[PDB]
Amino acid sequence: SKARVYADVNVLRPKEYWDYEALTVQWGEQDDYEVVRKVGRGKYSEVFEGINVNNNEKCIIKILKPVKKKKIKREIKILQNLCGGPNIVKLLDIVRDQHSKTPSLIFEYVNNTDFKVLYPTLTDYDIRYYIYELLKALDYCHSQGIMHRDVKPHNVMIDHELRKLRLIDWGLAEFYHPGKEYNVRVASRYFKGPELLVDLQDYDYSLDMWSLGCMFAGMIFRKEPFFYGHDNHDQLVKIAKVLGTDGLNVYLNKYRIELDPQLEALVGRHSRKPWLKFMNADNQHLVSPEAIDFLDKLLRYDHQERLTALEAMTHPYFQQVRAAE
Amino acid sequence: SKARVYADVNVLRPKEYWDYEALTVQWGEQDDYEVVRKVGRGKYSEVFEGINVNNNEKCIIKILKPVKKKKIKREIKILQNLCGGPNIVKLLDIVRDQHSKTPSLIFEYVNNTDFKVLYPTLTDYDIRYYIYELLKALDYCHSQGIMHRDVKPHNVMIDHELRKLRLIDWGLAEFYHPGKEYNVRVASRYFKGPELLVDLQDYDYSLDMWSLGCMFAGMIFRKEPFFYGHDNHDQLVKIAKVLGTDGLNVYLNKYRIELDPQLEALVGRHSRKPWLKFMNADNQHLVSPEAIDFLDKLLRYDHQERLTALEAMTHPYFQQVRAAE
Ligand SMILES: CN(C)c1nc2c(Br)c(Br)c(Br)c(Br)c2[nH]1
Numbered sequence: 001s002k003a004r005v006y007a008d009v010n011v012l013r014p015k016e017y018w019d020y021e022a023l024t025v026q027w028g029e030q031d032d033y034e035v036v037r038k039v040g041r042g043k044y045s046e047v048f049e050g051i052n053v054n055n056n057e058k059c060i061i062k063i064l065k066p067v068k069k070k071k072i073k074r075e076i077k078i079l080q081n082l083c084g085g086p087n088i089v090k091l092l093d094i095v096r097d098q099h100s101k102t103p104s105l106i107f108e109y110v111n112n113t114d115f116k117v118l119y120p121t122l123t124d125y126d127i128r129y130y131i132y133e134l135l136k137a138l139d140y141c142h143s144q145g146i147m148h149r150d151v152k153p154h155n156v157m158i159d160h161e162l163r164k165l166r167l168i169d170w171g172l173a174e175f176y177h178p179g180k181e182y183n184v185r186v187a188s189r190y191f192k193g194p195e196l197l198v199d200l201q202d203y204d205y206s207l208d209m210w211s212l213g214c215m216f217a218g219m220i221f222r223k224e225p226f227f228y229g230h231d232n233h234d235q236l237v238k239i240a241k242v243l244g245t246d247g248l249n250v251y252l253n254k255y256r257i258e259l260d261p262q263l264e265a266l267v268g269r270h271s272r273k274p275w276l277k278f279m280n281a282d283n284q285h286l287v288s289p290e291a292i293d294f295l296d297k298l299l300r301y302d303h304q305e306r307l308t309a310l311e312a313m314t315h316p317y318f319q320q321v322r323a324a325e
Numbered sequence: 326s327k328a329r330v331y332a333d334v335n336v337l338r339p340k341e342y343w344d345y346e347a348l349t350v351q352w353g354e355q356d357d358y359e360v361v362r363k364v365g366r367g368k369y370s371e372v373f374e375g376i377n378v379n380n381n382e383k384c385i386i387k388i389l390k391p392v393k394k395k396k397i398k399r400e401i402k403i404l405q406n407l408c409g410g411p412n413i414v415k416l417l418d419i420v421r422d423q424h425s426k427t428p429s430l431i432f433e434y435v436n437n438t439d440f441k442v443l444y445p446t447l448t449d450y451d452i453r454y455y456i457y458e459l460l461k462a463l464d465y466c467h468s469q470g471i472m473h474r475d476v477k478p479h480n481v482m483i484d485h486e487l488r489k490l491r492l493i494d495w496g497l498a499e500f501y502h503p504g505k506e507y508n509v510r511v512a513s514r515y516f517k518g519p520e521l522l523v524d525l526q527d528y529d530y531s532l533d534m535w536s537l538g539c540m541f542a543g544m545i546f547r548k549e550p551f552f553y554g555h556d557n558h559d560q561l562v563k564i565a566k567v568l569g570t571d572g573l574n575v576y577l578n579k580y581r582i583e584l585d586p587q588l589e590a591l592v593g594r595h596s597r598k599p600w601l602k603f604m605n606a607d608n609q610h611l612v613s614p615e616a617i618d619f620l621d622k623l624l625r626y627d628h629q630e631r632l633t634a635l636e637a638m639t640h641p642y643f644q645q646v647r648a649a650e
Pocket residue numbers: 039040041042045047060062089107108109110111112157166168169
């Protein structure tokens with residue numbers, strides 16, 4: 001398997017673009033940035049609103065938990081490669097504690113509203129709008145030779161009053177190289193593609209398009225998360241209960257993959273459930289034939305069959321958003 | 326049925342853009358342009374290479390056969406609306422014989438090579454290239470509220486040494502208005518969509534996308550024309566012998582259309598023929614999985630299901646063409 005687009009980007013670029021292991025970090029001044037208040041957190045970090053003492057501007061400070069040289073250089077390099085692209089969070093500076101040498105990444109500030117409070121208030125048009133903004137980001141990083149590998153609402157920051165969107169947390173991102181076999185332990189569970197769940201390791205940018213379909217589905221049907229599995233095997237089963245096992249089977253045959261026996265039994269046999277059966281009284285104002293058609297073309301087993309980011313931005317679902325632009 | 330894109334263009338524009346019947350033509354000087362040699366012809370005209378005596382530049386002169394005021398004002402207005410758009414033939418002047426008042430349209434010159442001689446020489450890449458150039462034209466006129474309604478190789482002029490392409494003959498073109506019922510006697514027979522052949526009159530820009538799929542199919546399989554019918558009923562039958570009647574049936578039910586009894590019998594019952602069965606030793610160098618995937622998404626019964634021009638330009642078939650650009 002190889003990507004159907006952007007496949008030779010890293011082949012054509014000079015090796016310094018992608019050989020992140022060769023990077024030498026140019027540390028900035030730790031004292032330039034002061035912590036004002038905690039605002040988020042995760043497995044690999046703690047995040048605060050900060051102030052740049054030089055200009056008194058707001059910023060975001062991501063203090064890293066102890067991390068391997070290899071891992072952090074990958075995140076920094078990718079962020080520097082993407083800085084300035086459409087709706088990509090901007091990395092402003094890199095600094096670290098002298099005594100402990102704990103690294104911090106410094107980012108632009110965003111007045112985000114957690115998706116559990118904000119998404120219930122979004123109109124039909126609002127949803128088209130914000131998802132179009134997310135696609136710009138994704139087409140950009142793919143075209144720069146990079147897969148995000150952790151798309152999900154928690155990693156999409158939004159200022160609703162300004163209506164501005166940023167794609168954050170580049171911790172799992174990686175450069176695409178034709179035929180390379182990748183680690184499948186990426187993404188977040190409710191958003192993992194079938195490739196990750198059946199151990200197909202030569203995957204590509206198209207993984208991110210599955211994750212986006214998962215997110216999009218949660219929003220129009222107001223059912224979050226859409227595929228609600230408890231573990232990786234159950235995750236594959238919940239998908240199978242909607243998409244159907246026949247297409248899962250044609251998928252495994254073409255890639256010549258075999259399911260763990262245990263897996264196979266849990267999955268079972270199931271007929272496809274059409275998307276209007278998800279429609280109901282709390283979501284009836286958001287489900288339209290164009291929303292469903294766009295969704296349908298993202299959530300496919302065969303990664304090679306999904307819309308690219310570039311194709312998705314042209315779907316008539318977004319026609320109004322494009323016209324306003 | 327309504328278009329899925331560009332539907333309100335003529336609604337939003339001032340009435341002078343589309344009310345062609347109100348046009349007052351501003352005739353130019355007949356003597357400015359001298360006939361040098363005949364180069365083409367058709368049902369409604371005769372076409373010559375000419376010279377602009379002022380600047381000694383080459384041009385093309387389209388002398389019209391006797392035509393109704395309504396009809397010619399439609400063609401002129403549409404041409405003036407589109408002049409300067411990507412790969413649209415440029416209308417330079419309009420003139421007429423004083424004694425007889427025979428109208429002539431004056432156009433830019435193109436050193437075209439008839440498709441029966443040129444297409445056999447085109448490489449795989451050449452085909453991607455020229456078809457991408459045709460799509461630019463089509464997305465442009467759709468976005469300007471106009472359907473071409475006669476797409477076909479005879480109406481695509483090409484200078485192979487310069488590799489430049491122009492979409493010509495706007496004689497059947499018309500403005501799109503939501504819900505209007507159109508005359509189905511348009512297009513050329515080998516390129517007519519199923520809508521025209523079953524008498525569905527509220528069709529839209531998507532008609533042109535069928536015609537393009539017909540052309541494209543002829544080129545990669547080197548089978549011209551691809552659907553070779555002798556009359557309108559036989560035309561529908563040849564299509565049915567490839568696409569299959571089941572999808573034809575789901576089509577007629579959704580639009581609530583009934584087939585002439587006579588028609589129904591000729592058509593019959595047929596299973597779909599997959600596109601690789603057309604592959605053979607004289608076309609094996611042009612048929613690729615991406616060519617076939619793109620084709621497949623143009624040739625659909627349901628006009629509402631076809632790719633738009635804008636979506637088609639993003640298909641990975643054209644990835645190399647886009648990169649070079
Ligand atoms: C939890 N985590 C990794 C995270 N939270 C963030 C928030 Br809140 C903002 Br606003 C920004 Br900008 C970025 Br960068 C963030 N990174």
